Design a protein around this ligand. Structure first.
Ligand SMILES: Nc1ncnc2c1ncn2[C@@H]1O[C@H](COP(=O)(O)OP(=O)(O)OP(=O)(O)OP(=O)(O)OP(=O)(O)OC[C@H]2O[C@@H](n3cnc4c(N)ncnc43)[C@H](O)[C@@H]2O)[C@@H](O)[C@H]1O
Ligand SMILES: [Mg+2]
Ligand SMILES: [Zn+2]
Length: 216
């Protein structure tokens, strides 16, 4: 079960992925989280990526592909993996094809989570994330039971620094222009699957899980 999750900023990749990893036990590999986790620890990777992330721009292909190649080679990706946010460029997609061809783990499905660009600003500005587990909430669409704290562990919630109007805009802009080429690339490959991500969270998952039977 080798999956790739794609979608414009705020389409619901993490919300979806959380789910999938709990039900199937495949590692959730988010390049965004990895970069985040690096900026937090102030690793050399974190410092270099910060420049692009804070601006809502894409981190260079070379370094990104490099960290994804190492991750996918981990013991935990034995029965599969869930890529989240990678690739988001055709060059990364082509690079990924060789890496997997090397690991002998070709992609089963690339799941595109379709959400109209004109509602993603609302999803991102109202997003609140748990500082403890990273699970996401939304003030209007899926708020915590007790405002400001995570349902699961009681940890404080925060607002990612790039979820400000100016940076969300640039993120939508940068990713929208990479979207059609990626869809084309995988549509040609034959394993692109489109899902309507503008429904209740358990409804989008329901569709997704129905593309996951038979994948080992
Ligand atoms: N491969 C790569 N190459 C180069 N650079 C890279 C890179 N990968 C990462 N980067 C860099 O890293 C940065 C950040 O990457 P990343 O963290 O991956 O940014 P992103 O792509 O913008 O995605 P998000 O995390 O913001 O959203 P998501 O789709 O997971 O949504 P969520 O589930 O939270 O949902 C959003 C909100 O909606 C709510 N929600 C979820 N589902 C629903 C639903 N069905 N209905 C209503 N609301 C919902 C949630 O509760 C939440 O509040 C980039 O700007 C870039 O610089
Ligand atoms: Mg995410
Ligand atoms: Zn939490």
């Amino acid at each position: 079960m080798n999956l790739v999750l794609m979608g414009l900023p705020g389409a619901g990749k993490g919300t979806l992925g959380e789910r999938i990893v709990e039900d199937y036990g495949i590692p959730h590999i988010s390049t965004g989280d990895m970069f985040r986790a690096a900026m937090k620890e102030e690793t050399p990777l974190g410092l270099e990526a910060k420049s692009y992330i804070d601006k809502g721009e894409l981190v260079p292909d070379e370094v990104t592909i490099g960290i994804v190649k190492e991750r996918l080679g981990k013991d935990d990706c034995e029965r599969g993996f869930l890529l989240d946010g990678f690739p988001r460029t055709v060059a990364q997609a082509e690079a990924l094809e060789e890496i997997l061809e090397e690991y002998g783990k070709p992609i089963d499905y690339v799941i595109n989570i379709e959400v109209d660009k004109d509602v993603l600003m609302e999803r991102l500005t109202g997003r609140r994330i748990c500082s403890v587990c990273g699970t996401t909430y939304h003030l209007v669409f899926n708020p915590p039971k007790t405002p400001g704290i995570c349902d699961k562990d009681g940890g404080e919630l925060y607002q990612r620094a790039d979820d400000n109007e100016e940076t969300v805009s640039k993120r939508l802009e940068v990713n929208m222009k990479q979207t059609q080429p990626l869809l084309d690339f995988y549509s040609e490959k034959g394993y692109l699957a489109n899902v309507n991500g503008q429904r209740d969270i358990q409804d989008v998952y329901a569709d997704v899980k129905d593309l996951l039977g038979g994948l080992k």
